[PDB]
């Protein structure tokens, strides 16, 4: 996250770190047994790490649970990142508490201008590299579809939205991928892609979760 702020420990209790020897993506807990992330975060041998703040220090509220199964969206296209969403089932259920909590799925899509919370342990520099040990947060609005499409002509589908600031300075970045965009208490986005980080007229691009709610519920219920 670039241009953000330190969230505070466990202030984002649905935020998960996906670990394969090292943090490589975020994700969101949606019930005690299931996490939603980006399809482009797919890897074998994922360990989900819940209740994290400093991902390099055991601070005492963590739960580390191996994934038992990953399900990538049937229509995921790795070339375009269309349908950039995947579900991850935990081998044992998470123990839910104030620091490890699920986030509601949307019942409808959010409108342009709605303020959202984006979070992750990704890079905090716009033109350099520096990775934080603690969770970073950014408040950012959903952008108009016309602004999003103008920024990325030929690349935005109905399953994507932009959020952030056209002036630049504030955005998600590498290592935030797969993590949450929460608006009015609902998981509306997944950190998906963009052009650089915090560049002018290049806001972050997010998977539009509200299009996937039927698929998520049917998939979880069947697996
Ligand atoms: Ca920790
Ligand atoms: Cl359309
Ligand atoms: Cl990434
Ligand atoms: Cl379930």
From Swiss-Prot:
PANTHER family: RIKEN CDNA 2210010C04 GENE (PTHR24264:SF15), TRYPSIN-RELATED (PTHR24264). It comes from the Eukaryota. Ca(2+) binds at residues 52, 54, 57, 62. Substrate binds at residues 171-172, 174-175, 177. It catalyses: Preferential cleavage: Arg-|-Xaa, Lys-|-Xaa. Disulfide bonds join 7-137, 25-41, 109-210, 116-183, 148-162, 173-197. Residues 1-221 form the Peptidase S1 domain. Its EC number is 3.4.21.4. InterPro entries: Peptidase_S1_PA, Peptidase_S1_PA_chymotrypsin, Peptidase_S1A, Serine_Proteases_S1, Trypsin_dom, TRYPSIN_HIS, TRYPSIN_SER. The lineage of its organism: Eukaryota, Metazoa, Chordata, Craniata, Vertebrata. It is found in: Secreted, Extracellular space. Belongs to the peptidase S1 family. It is an enzyme of class 3 (hydrolase). Its cofactor is Ca(2+). One of its GO terms (cellular component) is extracellular space. This is Serine protease 1. The active site is at residues 40, 84, 177. One of its GO terms (biological process) is digestion. Its main location: secreted.
């Amino acid at each position: 996250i670039v241009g953000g702020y330190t969230c505070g420990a466990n202030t984002v209790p649905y935020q998960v770190s996906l670990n394969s020897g090292y943090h490589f993506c975020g994700g969101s807990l949606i019930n005690s047994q299931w996490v939603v992330s980006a399809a482009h975060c797919y890897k074998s041998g994922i360990q989900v790490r819940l209740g994290e703040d400093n991902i390099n220090v055991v601070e005492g509220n963590e739960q580390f649970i191996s994934a038992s199964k990953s399900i990538v969206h049937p229509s995921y296209n790795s070339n375009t990142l269309n349908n950039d969403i995947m579900l991850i089932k935990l081998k044992s259920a998470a123990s839910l508490n104030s620091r490890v909590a699920s986030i509601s799925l949307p019942t409808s899509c959010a409108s342009a201008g709605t303020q959202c919370l984006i979070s992750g342990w990704g890079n905090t520099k716009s033109s350099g590299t520096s990775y934080p040990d603690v969770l970073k947060c950014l408040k950012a609005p959903i952008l108009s579809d016309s602004s999003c499409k103008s920024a990325y002509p030929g690349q935005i589908t109905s399953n994507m939205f932009c959020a952030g600031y056209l002036e630049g300075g504030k955005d998600s970045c590498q290592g935030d991928s797969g993590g949450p965009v929460v608006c009015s208490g609902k998981l509306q986005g997944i950190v998906s892609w963009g052009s650089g980080c915090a560049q002018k007229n290049k806001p972050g691009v997010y998977t539009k979760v509200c299009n996937y709610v039927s698929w998520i519920k049917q998939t979880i219920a069947s697996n």
